[PDB]
Amino acid sequence: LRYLH
Amino acid sequence: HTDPLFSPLDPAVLADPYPVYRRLRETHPVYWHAGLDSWLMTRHADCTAILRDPGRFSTDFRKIDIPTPPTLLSLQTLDPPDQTPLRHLALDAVRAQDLDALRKELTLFADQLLDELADRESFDFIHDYADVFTLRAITRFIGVEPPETDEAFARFNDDLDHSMDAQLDPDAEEPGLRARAHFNDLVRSWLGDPGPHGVLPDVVRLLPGSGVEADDVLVNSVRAFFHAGFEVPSRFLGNALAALLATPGAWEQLVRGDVGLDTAVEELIRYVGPVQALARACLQDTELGGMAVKEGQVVTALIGAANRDPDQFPDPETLRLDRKPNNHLGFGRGAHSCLGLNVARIEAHVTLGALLRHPGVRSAGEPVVRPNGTLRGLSRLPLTLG
Ligand code: HEM
Ligand SMILES: [Cl-]
């Protein structure tokens, strides 16, 4: 899980 | 191979992760998850501490010997002081916008869109309202012409979203980088021909003397700003409406004016805010929850779980639309806190205010959840306005 756009 | 406590992409967990979050918080509030190769923090105080300490918990995984793939070195993946010029430039460009003008045009657009949709028997709130509304909002705010919403656009967005979960599906990495490269091309076209108003024209105007080079790191940062601005409010609007319709008495409380939109919107962000996980690299041995977190390990702040922590919120599993106080973490904290939160709140207040003018609004079919554990939302929310 990496919150990267 | 299954984790004994938490399987974020299990369909039963995706249907409703909050009981699983709660059991995890009660059993191992600081938990080593082998499949995710990360500690998981499910308590509000621990998540807040992680987000407020970049010298200990970094967004730049190069500091623990993990290279940053192309398209991903950006505002999001730099720590102070390297991040600070870009962060200040983005703050300055965002603050130069007229939020009152934005609210006026979004109020009109939402009323027009819902009046058209009320002419239909039913519709998909996600594809037919939320995505249309949030794409309009972010492209007007940035000051750019929107992309076409064709099948390729949808597939690129799905590829980008799924790559947030690439730790559990390694094959998702390369399609995600291709999707970011695709949207970088869009950003480069915008930068070559800035419009008269918006965040992007002001970025260009503020660049001289900002300490920010007009390079690929800036491009990646603008891409992420655009893509989050499009997607995350859509995820939230669907989650929020689904929760209001599913909770007995919640919609009528708003219809009757027994609660205001200020506390209600904040309680919806706490209850079903879309961002589930914020990861950081540990740069120094640290004790959290009595666990020995080591330099070189990853920690993940499960802020969706933290926002239902009973240590912070009394009656946390209840949607209390008048909840006060409400110190939720839905927009992050510290050096990487959300740059779009004022736009996001305008979108939520405008949308709910517009829907409340159709009191007969009700589900017209089952919601469909996106198979994503990092950014949570719906792919379909069948609705009729009555
Ligand atoms: C309900 C809607 C939204 C929610 C819940 C939300 C949530 C968040 C959160 C939790 C973070 C922290 C990331 C981290 O700590 O790594 C963040 C960062 C960010 N958000 Fe939002 N966001 C929303 C809408 C938006 C909008 C509309 C925009 C643009 C107009 C935007 C732009 C950004 C950017 C650029 C960052 C990265 C800041 C940095 O790393 O320095 N977001 N958001
Ligand atoms: Cl690129």
Author numbering:
A (entry chain B): 1 to 5
B (entry chain A): 9 to 394
Task: Recite the paper's sentences.
RufO is a unique cytochrome P450 enzyme (CYP) involved in the biosynthesis of rufomycin, an antituberculosis cyclic peptide featuring an unusual nitrated tyrosine. RufO catalyzes tyrosyl nitration on a ribosomally synthesized pentapeptide encoded by an 18-bp gene. The newly identified pentapeptide substrate, MRYLH, is encoded by an 18-bp gene located upstream of the rufNO operon. RufO adopts a protein fold typical of CYPs, but it exhibits significant differences in the surface regions that are critical for substrate recognition and catalytic selectivity.
